[PDB]
Design an enzyme around this catalytic site. Sequence first.
Site, PDB file in Angstrom:
ATOM      1  N   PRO C   1       1.827  30.707  25.475  1.00 49.26           N
ATOM      2  CA  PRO C   1       2.531  31.118  26.775  1.00 49.26           C
ATOM      3  C   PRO C   1       2.264  32.530  26.432  1.00 49.26           C
ATOM      4  O   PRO C   1       2.190  33.284  25.506  1.00 49.26           O
ATOM      5  CB  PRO C   1       3.781  30.735  26.590  1.00 49.26           C
ATOM      6  CG  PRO C   1       4.226  30.498  25.517  1.00 49.26           C
ATOM      7  CD  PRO C   1       2.980  29.603  24.726  1.00 49.26           C
ATOM      8  N   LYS C  32       6.224  25.060  22.318  1.00 46.13           N
ATOM      9  CA  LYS C  32       4.642  25.476  22.052  1.00 46.13           C
ATOM     10  C   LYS C  32       4.923  25.969  20.737  1.00 46.13           C
ATOM     11  O   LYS C  32       5.766  26.521  20.032  1.00 46.13           O
ATOM     12  CB  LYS C  32       4.422  26.843  23.093  1.00 46.13           C
ATOM     13  CG  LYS C  32       4.454  26.228  24.642  1.00 46.13           C
ATOM     14  CD  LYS C  32       3.373  25.716  25.095  1.00 46.13           C
ATOM     15  CE  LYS C  32       3.425  25.449  26.533  1.00 46.13           C
ATOM     16  NZ  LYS C  32       2.039  24.851  27.125  1.00 46.13           N
ATOM     17  N   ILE C  64       0.941  27.116  30.483  1.00 43.00           N
ATOM     18  CA  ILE C  64       0.336  25.958  31.009  1.00 43.00           C
ATOM     19  C   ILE C  64       1.366  24.822  31.031  1.00 43.00           C
ATOM     20  O   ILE C  64       2.217  24.633  30.000  1.00 43.00           O
ATOM     21  CB  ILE C  64      -0.708  25.690  30.180  1.00 43.00           C
ATOM     22  CG1 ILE C  64      -1.828  26.557  30.295  1.00 43.00           C
ATOM     23  CG2 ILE C  64      -1.220  24.137  30.692  1.00 43.00           C
ATOM     24  CD1 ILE C  64      -3.288  26.100  29.829  1.00 43.00           C
TER      25      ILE C  64
END
Lengths: 117, 117, 117
Positions: C1, C32, C64
């Site tokens: 990110p 993540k 995402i």
Amino acid sequence: PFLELDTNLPANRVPAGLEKRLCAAAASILGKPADRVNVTVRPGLAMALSGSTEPCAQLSISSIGVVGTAEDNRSHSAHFFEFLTKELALGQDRILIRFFPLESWQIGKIGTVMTFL
Amino acid sequence: PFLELDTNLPANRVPAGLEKRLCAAAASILGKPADRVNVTVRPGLAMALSGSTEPCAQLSISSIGVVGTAEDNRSHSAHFFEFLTKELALGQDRILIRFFPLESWQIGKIGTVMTFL
Amino acid sequence: PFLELDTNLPANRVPAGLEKRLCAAAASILGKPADRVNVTVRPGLAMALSGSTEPCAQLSISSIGVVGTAEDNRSHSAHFFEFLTKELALGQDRILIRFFPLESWQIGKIGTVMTFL
Ligand SMILES: *c1cc(-c2ccccc2)ncn1
Ligand SMILES: *c1cc(-c2ccccc2)ncn1
Ligand SMILES: *c1cc(-c2ccccc2)ncn1
Ligand SMILES: [Cl-]
Ligand SMILES: [Cl-]
Ligand SMILES: [Cl-]
């Protein structure tokens, strides 16, 4: 709304108090409460606008509801250009604006999102 | 198009004239007139890219029409990586790009929006 | 990110090492890998948040898959507010977040886009 202003004017060529005056201006233009307006000014950057490194500024405006149409944004643009040309002593050729609609699920505030407020 | 480059390289490690050379490069890559390209460089920031605070850069490219597909953006990416790796003396692991399609009603210019120009 | 933090705190009032601690925090919050997190901090800006020029910060999070719902973003917001209020010594009234979903064709990396990786 969220207003972000990038400029290659050094900080000492951006008039004192601009960020608060831009809150008041944006409130009137966008039909939002002045106490909810957010302004970020980033001066002293290295910029070219339309290929030229003369003094310039780039404004971004992100908001719920009011920046999603051409007809509305035309009006907003006219008023923000009036404000910024005079405040920054820039010609109309030296400013551009981008408009970004937001939805409530995108705005994190007080540890939640606006969807739930 | 609107190109924005954030870097933790100090200003004195960003080569003089980069913003104008990036206008020329972007014109060729994106198929746009060099005199319409906009570049903003924000150096001296505090950055981590892929978890690391070594020198790095983040490019954002916002444009009408030409940055909306994977296949196009693959090509654009290759060319912008070539440009920036050499200009900034950065490895390919130290740059990322984001692509943002814009529509004409989002671009405020000369006190109106592009929809009406 | 991609995390971007604008603040009117001067650089010397942003704690040393923040950008790496924000990578670790974001990894845990967003699910993540820490070695894929990107952080950009832009201190010393001129800002008003909710009409006030007192110390404040604006975080943007682009990712995402994981920042597209209100329910998810509520959770993310709670955790990022906990992190930033304590790190920056700011009240919850002095921080806002924006969440931006990205798709793989928007992310240029290693001279291609993520669609092909
Ligand atoms: C601009 C305005 C607002 C806001 C929030 C609550 C009520 C009115 C307006 N939030 C973010 N940016
Ligand atoms: C990039 C390019 C342009 C532009 C405007 C008119 C004609 C061609 C290209 N505008 C903004 N950003
Ligand atoms: C955040 C995370 C990533 C990433 C890329 C590959 C695998 C996991 C996560 N990329 C950009 N921003
Ligand atoms: Cl708003
Ligand atoms: Cl364009
Ligand atoms: Cl991601």
